Coordinates of C-alpha atoms in Angstrom, one line a residue:
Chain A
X1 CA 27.9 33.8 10.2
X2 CA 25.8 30.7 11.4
X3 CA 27.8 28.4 14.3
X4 CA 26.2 25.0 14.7
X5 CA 26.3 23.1 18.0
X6 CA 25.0 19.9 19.9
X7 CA 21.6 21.4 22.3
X8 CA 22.0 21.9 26.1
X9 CA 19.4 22.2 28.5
X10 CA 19.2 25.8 28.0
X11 CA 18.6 25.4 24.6
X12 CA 15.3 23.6 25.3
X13 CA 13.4 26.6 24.4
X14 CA 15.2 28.3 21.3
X15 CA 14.5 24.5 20.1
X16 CA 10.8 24.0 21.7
X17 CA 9.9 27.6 19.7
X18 CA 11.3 26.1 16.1
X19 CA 9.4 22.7 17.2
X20 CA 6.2 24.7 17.6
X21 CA 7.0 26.3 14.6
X22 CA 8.1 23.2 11.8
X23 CA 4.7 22.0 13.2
X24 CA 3.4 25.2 12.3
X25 CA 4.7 24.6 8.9
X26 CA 3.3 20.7 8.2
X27 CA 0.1 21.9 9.4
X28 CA 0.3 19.2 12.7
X29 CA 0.0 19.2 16.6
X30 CA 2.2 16.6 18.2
X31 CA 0.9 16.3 22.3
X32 CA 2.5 18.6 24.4
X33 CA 4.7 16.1 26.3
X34 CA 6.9 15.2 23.2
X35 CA 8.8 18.0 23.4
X36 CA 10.3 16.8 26.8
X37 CA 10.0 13.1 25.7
X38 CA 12.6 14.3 22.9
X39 CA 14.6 16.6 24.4
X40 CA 15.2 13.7 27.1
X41 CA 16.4 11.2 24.2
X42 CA 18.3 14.5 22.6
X43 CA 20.7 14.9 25.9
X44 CA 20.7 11.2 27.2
X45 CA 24.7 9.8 26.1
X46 CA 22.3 6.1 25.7
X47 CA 19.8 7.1 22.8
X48 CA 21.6 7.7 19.8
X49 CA 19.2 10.4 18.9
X50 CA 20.5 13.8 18.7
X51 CA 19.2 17.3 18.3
X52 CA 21.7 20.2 17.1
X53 CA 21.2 24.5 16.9
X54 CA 22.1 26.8 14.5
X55 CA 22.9 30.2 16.8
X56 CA 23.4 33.2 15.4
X57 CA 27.0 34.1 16.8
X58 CA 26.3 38.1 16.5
X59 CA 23.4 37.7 18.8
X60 CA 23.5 34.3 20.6
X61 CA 19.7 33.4 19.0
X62 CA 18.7 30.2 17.9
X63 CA 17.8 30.3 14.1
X64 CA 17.5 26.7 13.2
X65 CA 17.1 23.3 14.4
X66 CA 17.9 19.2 13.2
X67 CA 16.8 16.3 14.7
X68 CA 18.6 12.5 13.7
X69 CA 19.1 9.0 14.6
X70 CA 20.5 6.4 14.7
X71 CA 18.8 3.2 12.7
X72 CA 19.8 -0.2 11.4
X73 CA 20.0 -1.7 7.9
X74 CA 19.6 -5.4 6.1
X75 CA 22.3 -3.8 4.2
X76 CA 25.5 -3.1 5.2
X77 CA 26.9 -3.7 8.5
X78 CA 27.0 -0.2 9.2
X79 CA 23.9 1.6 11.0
X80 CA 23.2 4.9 9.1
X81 CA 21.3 8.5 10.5
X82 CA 18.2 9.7 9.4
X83 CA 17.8 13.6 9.6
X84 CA 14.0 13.2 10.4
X85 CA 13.5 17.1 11.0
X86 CA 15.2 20.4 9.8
X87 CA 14.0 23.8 10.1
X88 CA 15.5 27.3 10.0
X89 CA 14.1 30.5 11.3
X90 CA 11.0 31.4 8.9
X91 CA 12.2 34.9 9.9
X92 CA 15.4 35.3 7.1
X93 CA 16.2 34.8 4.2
X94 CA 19.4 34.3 2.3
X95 CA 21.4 33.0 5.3
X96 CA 23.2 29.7 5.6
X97 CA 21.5 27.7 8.0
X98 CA 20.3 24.6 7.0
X99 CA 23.5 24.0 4.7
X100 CA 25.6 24.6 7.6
X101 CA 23.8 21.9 9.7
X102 CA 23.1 19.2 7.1
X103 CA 26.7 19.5 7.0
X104 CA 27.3 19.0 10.8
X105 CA 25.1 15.9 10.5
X106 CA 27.8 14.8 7.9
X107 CA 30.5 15.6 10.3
X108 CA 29.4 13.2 13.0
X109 CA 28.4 11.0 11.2
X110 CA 31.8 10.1 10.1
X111 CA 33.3 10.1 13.1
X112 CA 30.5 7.8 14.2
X113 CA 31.1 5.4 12.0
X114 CA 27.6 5.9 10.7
X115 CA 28.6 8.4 7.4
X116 CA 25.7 7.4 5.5
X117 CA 22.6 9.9 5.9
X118 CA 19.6 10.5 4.4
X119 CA 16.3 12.4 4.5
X120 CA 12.8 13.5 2.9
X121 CA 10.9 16.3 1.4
X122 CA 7.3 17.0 -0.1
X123 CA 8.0 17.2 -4.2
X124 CA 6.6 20.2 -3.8
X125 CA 8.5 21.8 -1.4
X126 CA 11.2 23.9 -4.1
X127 CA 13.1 26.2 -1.7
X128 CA 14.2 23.4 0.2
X129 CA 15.3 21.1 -2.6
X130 CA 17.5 24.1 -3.8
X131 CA 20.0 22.8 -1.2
X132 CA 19.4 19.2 -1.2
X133 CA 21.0 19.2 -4.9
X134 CA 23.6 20.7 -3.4
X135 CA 24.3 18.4 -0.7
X136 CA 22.7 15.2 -2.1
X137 CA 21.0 13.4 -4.5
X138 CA 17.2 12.6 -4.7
X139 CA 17.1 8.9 -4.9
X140 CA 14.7 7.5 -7.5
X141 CA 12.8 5.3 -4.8
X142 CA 8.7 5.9 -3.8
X143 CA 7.8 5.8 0.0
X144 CA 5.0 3.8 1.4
X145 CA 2.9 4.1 4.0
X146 CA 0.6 1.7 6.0
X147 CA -3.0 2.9 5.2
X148 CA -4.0 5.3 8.4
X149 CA -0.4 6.1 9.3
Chain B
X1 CA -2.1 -22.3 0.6
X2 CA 1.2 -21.0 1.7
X3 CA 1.9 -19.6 5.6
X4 CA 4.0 -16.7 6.8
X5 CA 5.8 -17.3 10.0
X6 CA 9.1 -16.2 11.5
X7 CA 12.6 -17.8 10.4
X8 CA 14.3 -20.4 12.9
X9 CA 18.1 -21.2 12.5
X10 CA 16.7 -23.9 9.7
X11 CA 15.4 -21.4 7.4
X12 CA 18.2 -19.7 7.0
X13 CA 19.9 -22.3 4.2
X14 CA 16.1 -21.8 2.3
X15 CA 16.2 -17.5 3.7
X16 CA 19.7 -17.2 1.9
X17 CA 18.6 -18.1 -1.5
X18 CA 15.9 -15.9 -1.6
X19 CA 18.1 -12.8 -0.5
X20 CA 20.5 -13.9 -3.1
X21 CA 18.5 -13.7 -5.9
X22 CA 17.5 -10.2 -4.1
X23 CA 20.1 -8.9 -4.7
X24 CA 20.1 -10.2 -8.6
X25 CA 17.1 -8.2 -9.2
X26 CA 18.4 -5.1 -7.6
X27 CA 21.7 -4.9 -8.9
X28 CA 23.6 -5.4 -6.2
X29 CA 26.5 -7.4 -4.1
X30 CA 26.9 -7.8 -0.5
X31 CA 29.6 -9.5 0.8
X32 CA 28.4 -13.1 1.6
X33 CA 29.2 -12.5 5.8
X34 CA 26.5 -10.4 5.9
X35 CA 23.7 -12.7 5.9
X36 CA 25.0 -14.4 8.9
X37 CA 25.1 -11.1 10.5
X38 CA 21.6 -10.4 9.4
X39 CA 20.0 -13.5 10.2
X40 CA 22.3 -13.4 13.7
X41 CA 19.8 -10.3 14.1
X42 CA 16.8 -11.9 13.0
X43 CA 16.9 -14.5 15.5
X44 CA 18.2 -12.3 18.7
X45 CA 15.3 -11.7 20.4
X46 CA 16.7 -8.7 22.4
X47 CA 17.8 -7.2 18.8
X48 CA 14.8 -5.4 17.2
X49 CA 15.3 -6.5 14.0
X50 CA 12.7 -9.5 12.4
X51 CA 12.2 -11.4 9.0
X52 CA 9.7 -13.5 8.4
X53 CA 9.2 -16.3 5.5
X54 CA 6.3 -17.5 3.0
X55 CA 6.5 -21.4 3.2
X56 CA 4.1 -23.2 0.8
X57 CA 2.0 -24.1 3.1
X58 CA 1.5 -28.5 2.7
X59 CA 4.5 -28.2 0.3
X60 CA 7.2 -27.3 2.2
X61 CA 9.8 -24.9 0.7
X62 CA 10.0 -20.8 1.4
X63 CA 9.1 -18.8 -1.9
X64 CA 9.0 -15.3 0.3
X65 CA 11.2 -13.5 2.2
X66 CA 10.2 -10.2 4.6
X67 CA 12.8 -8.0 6.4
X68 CA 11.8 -5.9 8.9
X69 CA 13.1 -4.0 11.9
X70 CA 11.7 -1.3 14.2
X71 CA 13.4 2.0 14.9
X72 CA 12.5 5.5 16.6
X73 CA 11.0 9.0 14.9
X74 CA 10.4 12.5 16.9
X75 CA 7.5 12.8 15.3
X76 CA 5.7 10.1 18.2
X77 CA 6.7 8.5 21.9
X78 CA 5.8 5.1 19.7
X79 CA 8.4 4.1 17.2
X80 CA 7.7 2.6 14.0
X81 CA 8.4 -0.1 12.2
X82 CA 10.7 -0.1 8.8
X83 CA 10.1 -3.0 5.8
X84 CA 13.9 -3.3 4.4
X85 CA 13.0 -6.4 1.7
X86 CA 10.5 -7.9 0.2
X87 CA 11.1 -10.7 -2.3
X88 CA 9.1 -13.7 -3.6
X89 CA 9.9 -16.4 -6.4
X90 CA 9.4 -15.1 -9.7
X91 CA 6.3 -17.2 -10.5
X92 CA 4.2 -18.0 -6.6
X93 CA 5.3 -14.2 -6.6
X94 CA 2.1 -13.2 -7.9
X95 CA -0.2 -15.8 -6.3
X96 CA -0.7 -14.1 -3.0
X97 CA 2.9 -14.3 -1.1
X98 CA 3.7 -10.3 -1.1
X99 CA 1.0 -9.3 0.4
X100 CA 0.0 -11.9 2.6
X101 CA 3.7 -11.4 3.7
X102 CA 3.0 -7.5 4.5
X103 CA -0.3 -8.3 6.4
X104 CA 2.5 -10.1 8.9
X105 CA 4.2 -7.4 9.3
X106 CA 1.0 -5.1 10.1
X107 CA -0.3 -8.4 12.0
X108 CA 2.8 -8.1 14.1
X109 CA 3.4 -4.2 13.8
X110 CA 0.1 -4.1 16.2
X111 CA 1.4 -6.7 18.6
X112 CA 4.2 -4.7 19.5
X113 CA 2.4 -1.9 19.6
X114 CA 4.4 0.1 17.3
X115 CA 1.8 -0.2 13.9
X116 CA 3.2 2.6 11.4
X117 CA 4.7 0.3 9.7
X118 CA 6.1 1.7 6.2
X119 CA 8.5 1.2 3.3
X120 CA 9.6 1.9 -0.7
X121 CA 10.8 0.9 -4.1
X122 CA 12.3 2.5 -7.0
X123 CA 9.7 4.5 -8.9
X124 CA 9.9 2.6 -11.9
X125 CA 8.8 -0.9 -10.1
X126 CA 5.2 -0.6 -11.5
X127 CA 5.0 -4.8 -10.6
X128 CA 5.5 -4.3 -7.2
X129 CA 3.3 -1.0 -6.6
X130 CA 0.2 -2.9 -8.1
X131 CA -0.1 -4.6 -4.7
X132 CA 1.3 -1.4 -3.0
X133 CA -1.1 0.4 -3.7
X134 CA -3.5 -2.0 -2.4
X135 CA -2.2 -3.2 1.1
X136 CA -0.7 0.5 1.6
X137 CA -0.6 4.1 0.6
X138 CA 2.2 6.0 -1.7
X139 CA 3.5 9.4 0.3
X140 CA 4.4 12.4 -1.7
X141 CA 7.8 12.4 -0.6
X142 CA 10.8 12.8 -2.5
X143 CA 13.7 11.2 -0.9
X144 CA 17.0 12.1 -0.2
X145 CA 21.1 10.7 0.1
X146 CA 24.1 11.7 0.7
X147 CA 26.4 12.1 -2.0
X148 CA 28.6 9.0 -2.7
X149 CA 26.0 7.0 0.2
Chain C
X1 CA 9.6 48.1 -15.8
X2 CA 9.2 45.5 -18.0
X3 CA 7.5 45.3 -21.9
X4 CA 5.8 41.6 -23.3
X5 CA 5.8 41.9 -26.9
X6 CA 5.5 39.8 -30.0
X7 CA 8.9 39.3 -31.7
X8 CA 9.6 41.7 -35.2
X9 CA 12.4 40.9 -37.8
X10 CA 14.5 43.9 -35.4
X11 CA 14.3 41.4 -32.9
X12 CA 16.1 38.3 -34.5
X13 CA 19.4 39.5 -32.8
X14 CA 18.4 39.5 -29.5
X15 CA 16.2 36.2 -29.9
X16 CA 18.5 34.2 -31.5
X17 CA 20.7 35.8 -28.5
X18 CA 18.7 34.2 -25.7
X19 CA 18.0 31.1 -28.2
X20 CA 21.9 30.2 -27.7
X21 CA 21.9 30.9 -24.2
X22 CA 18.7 29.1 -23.7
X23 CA 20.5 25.6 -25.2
X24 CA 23.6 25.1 -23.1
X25 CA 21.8 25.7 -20.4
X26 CA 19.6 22.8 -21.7
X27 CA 22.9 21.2 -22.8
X28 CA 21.7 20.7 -26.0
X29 CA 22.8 22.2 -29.8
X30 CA 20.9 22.7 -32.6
X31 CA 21.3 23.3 -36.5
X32 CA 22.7 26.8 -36.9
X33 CA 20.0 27.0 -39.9
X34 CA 16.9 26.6 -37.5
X35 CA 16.7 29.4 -35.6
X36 CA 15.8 31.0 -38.9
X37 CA 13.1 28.5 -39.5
X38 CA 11.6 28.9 -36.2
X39 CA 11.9 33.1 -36.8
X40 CA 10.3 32.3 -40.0
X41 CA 7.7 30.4 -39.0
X42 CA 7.5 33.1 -35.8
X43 CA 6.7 36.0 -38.3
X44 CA 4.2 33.9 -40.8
X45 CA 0.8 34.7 -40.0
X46 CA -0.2 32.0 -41.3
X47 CA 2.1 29.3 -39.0
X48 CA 0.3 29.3 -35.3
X49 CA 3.9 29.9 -33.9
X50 CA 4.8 32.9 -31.7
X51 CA 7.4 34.2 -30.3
X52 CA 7.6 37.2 -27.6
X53 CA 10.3 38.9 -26.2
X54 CA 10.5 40.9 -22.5
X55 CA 12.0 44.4 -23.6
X56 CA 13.6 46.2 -20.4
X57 CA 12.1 49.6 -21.4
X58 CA 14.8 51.9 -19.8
X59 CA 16.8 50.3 -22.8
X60 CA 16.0 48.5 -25.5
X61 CA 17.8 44.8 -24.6
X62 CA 15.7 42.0 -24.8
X63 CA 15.9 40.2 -21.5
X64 CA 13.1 37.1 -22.3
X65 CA 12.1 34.5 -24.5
X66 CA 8.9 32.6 -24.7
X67 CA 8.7 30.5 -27.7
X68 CA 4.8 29.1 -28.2
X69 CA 2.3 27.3 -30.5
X70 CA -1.0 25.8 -31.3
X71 CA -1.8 22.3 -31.3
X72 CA -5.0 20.0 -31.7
X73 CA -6.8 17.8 -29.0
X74 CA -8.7 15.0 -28.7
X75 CA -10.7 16.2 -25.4
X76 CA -12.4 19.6 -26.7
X77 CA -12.5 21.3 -30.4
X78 CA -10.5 24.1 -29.7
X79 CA -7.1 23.8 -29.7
X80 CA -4.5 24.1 -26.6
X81 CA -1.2 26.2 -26.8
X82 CA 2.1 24.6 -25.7
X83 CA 4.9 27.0 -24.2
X84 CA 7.7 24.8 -26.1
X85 CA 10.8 27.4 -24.5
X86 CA 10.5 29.7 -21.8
X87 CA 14.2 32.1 -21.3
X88 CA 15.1 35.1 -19.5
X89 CA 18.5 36.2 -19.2
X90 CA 20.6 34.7 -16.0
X91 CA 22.1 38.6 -15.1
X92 CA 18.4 40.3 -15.5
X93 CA 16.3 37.1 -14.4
X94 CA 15.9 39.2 -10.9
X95 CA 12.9 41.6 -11.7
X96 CA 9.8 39.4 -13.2
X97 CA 10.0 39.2 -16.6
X98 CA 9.5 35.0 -17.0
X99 CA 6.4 36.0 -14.6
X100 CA 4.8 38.1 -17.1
X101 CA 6.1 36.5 -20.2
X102 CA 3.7 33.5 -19.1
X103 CA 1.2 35.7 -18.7
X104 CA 1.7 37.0 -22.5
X105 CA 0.6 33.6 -23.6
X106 CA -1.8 33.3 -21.6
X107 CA -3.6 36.2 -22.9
X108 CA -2.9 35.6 -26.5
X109 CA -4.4 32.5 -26.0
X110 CA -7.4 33.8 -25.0
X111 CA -7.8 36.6 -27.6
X112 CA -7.4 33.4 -29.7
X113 CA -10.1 31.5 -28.5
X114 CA -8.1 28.7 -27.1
X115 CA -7.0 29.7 -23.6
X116 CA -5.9 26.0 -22.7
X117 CA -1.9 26.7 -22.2
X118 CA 0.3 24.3 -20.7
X119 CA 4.5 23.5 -20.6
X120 CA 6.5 21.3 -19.0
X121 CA 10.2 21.4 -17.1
X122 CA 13.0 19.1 -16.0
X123 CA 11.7 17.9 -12.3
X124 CA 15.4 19.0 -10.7
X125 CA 14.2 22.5 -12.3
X126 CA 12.9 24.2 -8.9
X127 CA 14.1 27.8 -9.4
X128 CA 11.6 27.8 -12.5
X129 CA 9.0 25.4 -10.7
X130 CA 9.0 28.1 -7.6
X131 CA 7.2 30.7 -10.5
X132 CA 5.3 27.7 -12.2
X133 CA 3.6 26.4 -9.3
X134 CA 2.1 30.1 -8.9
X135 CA 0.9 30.9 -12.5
X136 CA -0.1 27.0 -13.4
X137 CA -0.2 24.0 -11.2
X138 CA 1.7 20.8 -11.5
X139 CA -0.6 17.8 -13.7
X140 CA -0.4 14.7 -12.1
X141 CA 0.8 12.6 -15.4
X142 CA 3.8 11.0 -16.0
X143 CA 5.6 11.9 -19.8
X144 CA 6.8 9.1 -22.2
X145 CA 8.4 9.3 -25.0
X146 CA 9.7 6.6 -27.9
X147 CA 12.8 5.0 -27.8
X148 CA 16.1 6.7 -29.2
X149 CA 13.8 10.2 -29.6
Chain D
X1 CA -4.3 -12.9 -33.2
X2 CA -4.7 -8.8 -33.6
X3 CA -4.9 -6.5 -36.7
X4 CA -4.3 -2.7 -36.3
X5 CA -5.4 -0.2 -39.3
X6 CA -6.3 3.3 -39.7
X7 CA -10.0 3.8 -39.1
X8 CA -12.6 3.2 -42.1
X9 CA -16.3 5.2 -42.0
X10 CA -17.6 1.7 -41.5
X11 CA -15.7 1.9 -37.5
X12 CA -17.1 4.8 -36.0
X13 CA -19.8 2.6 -34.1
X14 CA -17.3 0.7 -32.5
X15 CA -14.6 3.8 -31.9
X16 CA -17.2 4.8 -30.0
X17 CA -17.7 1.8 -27.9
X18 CA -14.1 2.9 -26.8
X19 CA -14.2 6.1 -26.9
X20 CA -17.1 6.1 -23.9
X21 CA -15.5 3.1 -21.9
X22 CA -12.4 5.5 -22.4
X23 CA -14.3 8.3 -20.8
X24 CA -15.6 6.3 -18.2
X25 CA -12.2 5.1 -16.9
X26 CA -10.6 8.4 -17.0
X27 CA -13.7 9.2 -15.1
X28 CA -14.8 12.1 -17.8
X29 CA -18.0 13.1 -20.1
X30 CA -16.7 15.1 -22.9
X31 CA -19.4 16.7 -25.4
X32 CA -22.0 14.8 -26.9
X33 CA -21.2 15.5 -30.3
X34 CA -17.1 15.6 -30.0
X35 CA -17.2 12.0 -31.4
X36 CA -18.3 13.2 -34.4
X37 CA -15.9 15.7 -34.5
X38 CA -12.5 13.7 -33.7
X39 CA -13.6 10.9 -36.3
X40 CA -14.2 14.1 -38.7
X41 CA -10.3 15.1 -38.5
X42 CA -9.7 11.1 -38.1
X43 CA -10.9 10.6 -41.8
X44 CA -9.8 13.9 -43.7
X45 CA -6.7 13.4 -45.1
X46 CA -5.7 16.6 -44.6
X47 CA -5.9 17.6 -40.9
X48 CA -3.0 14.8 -39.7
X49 CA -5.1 13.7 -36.9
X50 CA -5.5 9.9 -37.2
X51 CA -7.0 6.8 -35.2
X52 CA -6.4 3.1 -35.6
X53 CA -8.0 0.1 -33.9
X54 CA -7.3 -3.2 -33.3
X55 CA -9.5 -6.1 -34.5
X56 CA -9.9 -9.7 -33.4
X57 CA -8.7 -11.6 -36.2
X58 CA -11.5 -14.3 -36.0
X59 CA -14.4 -12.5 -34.2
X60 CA -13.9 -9.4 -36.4
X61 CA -14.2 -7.1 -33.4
X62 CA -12.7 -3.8 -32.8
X63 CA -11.0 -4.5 -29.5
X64 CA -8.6 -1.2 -28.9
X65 CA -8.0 2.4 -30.3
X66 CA -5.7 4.9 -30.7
X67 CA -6.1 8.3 -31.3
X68 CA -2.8 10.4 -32.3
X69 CA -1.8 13.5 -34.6
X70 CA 1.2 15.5 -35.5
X71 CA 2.5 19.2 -34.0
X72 CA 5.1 21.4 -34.6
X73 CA 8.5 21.4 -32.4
X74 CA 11.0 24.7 -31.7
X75 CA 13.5 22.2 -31.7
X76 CA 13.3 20.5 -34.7
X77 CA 12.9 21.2 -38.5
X78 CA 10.6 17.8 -38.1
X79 CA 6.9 17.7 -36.1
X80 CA 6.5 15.1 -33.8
X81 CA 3.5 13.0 -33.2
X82 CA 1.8 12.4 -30.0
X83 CA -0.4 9.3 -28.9
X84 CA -3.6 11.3 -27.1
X85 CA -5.8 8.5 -26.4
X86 CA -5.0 4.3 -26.1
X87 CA -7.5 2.0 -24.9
X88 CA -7.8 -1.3 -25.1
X89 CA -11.2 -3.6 -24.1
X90 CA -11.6 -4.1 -20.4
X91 CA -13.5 -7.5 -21.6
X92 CA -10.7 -8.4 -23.4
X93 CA -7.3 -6.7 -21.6
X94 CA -3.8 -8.6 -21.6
X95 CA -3.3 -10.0 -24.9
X96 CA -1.5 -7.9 -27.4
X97 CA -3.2 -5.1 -28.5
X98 CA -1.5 -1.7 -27.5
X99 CA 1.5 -2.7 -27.6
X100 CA 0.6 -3.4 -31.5
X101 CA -1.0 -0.5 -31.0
X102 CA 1.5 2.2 -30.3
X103 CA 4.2 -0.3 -32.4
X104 CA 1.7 0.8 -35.6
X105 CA 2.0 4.3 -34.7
X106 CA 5.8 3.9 -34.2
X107 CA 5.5 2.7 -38.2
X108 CA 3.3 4.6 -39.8
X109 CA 5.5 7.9 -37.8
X110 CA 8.7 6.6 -39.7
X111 CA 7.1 6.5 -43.2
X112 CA 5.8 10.1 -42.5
X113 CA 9.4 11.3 -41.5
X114 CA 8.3 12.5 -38.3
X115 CA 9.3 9.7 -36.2
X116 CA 9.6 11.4 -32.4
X117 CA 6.5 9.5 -30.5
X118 CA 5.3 10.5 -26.8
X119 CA 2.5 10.2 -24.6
X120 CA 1.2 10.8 -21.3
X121 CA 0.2 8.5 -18.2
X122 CA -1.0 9.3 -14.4
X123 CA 1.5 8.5 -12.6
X124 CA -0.3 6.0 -10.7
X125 CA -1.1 4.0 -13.9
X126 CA 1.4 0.8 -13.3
X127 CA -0.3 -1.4 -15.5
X128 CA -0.4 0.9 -18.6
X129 CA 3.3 1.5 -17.6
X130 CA 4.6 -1.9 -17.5
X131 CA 4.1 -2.1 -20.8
X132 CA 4.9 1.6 -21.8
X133 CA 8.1 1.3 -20.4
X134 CA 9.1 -1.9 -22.8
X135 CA 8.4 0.5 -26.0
X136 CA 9.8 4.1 -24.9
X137 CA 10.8 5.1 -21.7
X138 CA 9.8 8.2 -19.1
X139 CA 10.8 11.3 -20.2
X140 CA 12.2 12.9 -16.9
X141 CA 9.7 16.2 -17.5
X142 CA 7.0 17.3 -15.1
X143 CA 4.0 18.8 -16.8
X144 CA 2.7 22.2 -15.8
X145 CA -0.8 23.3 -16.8
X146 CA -2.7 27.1 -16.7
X147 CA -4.6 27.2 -13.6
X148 CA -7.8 27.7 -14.9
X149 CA -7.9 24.8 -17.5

């Protein structure tokens, strides 16, 4: 049994070890400071960026982490949340992490106001898109990037 | 010719007609007090949120239309910058509008110092991604909604 | 452990088994009269069509299906082998069989000369795709096909 | 105005005009004596392997190719027939010929009784996809290949 929740400051390293790690996995090295620089905009009430935990409740150990924000749109009047990382613990498989916090990204996002969220994936990445069927729907549109970025 | 330069409350009469027929070519409706919200944006220059419009150039009229806004990632203390629409006539479309109309952006993107500037289309809009290709770079990314968003 | 062998008339049962399972999952529905066609063509020497089964060896249940055949090219002189149906049975899928069922064919292909195999899948296929992308690697090309066919 | 036909022994010379400005394009050097080969199988009536090109009307010239054959199907008492190679003049490109093309094959398919036509693309190849997209339509398959060849 997973149990999703909003970070504290005492939750800046069980998410600053799955930070290291996502960048781990992605093969990048993002500069030392943007941990802090994040973790700032995660707790501030003013930037509507947030950061949530997935703690294993028979151990009190952070297994996985998702960061969103908030972003606006030509379309619709209504902002809408980008989950622009997720990554469980590399360390078990089988669990229910990942579904559990997509989900609580759904949750307040309705109560928001903002219920409309989306994310990416490499097409190669499988194991993940597993749960994205389940969740969502991969929309037929091609991202593009300015050359060097 | 033709010249790209940001909208001013007068373009919005010639701006609306090329998000009209936008929305013809992608299917879609929004309700008609959305452009004034929109162009409301545009204009604020405390709201981060541009558009910018392809004028012939020693002929008057706009034949392209740009929207843009700029929005925050975790992945970088910069933020970036987001292309929403993109949409010349179908005819000057060709003759150099779209992607003089993204070189703005990138023009601009640097100014504010916040250059990954980035965007997408549906997969089957080969038209559009033979100047995509070009001016930018397709990611392997698959993306991702919320069911019923 | 787990037996790879060509199909014999004993096996039409189990085949034709798998064969029905193999199209709802699909979603699709064939003649009834086919399967013999296909079986016939299977057995014929003479018709480059092959068929093998994965035999569970503590019993005798036929678990997989590969369905393959030979095919001319226009880029070499020997000819390449397409994998047109690859099956294993959903409540026995857990051990490896589709893993070495591949591997069958790809042996059989080169005691026939003409070790070029290839198949394809539904992109929203990843369980499969999470073996593929191990034994075989994903082309870079884009299928068509006619209208109404 | 364009003229498609089946190749004669007196078109060779110019198949193979296409053929290596084929090659070239697909950035490729296959044997030096598959020419030969191809335009063996191309003329025997009995290996159902067959090219057409397209001739200028006036000049007389062979402008395009196409090279395509027929192959067996599990799921279907009928063989289909798969375009391998189209190529049209670089010298002479966006004019007709292709889309005659592939259209011939489309006829020539129904009088044989096999009438399901596919092909391939990259997936990068807009251009050639603006126009495939008008005569069939993509097959939502992703094409997996041995990892050696």
């Amino acid at each position: 049994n997973i149990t999703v929740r909003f970070v504290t400051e005492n939750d800046k390293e069980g998410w600053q070890r799955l930070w290291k790690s996502y960048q781990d996995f992605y093969e990048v090295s993002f500069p030392d400071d943007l941990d802090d620089f994040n973790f700032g905009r995660f707790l501030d009430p003013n930037i509507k960026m947030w950061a949530a935990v997935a703690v294993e409740s028979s151990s009190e150990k952070i297994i996985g982490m998702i960061n969103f924000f908030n972003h606006m749109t030509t379309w619709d009047f209504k902002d809408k949340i980008y989950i622009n990382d997720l990554y469980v613990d590399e360390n078990s498989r089988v669990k229910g992490a990942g579904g559990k916090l997509i989900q609580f990204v759904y949750d307040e996002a309705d109560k928001l106001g903002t219920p409309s969220v989306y994310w990416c994936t490499d097409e190669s990445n499988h194991r993940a898109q597993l749960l994205y069927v389940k969740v969502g729907y991969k929309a037929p549109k091609i991202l593009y990037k300015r050359k060097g970025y």
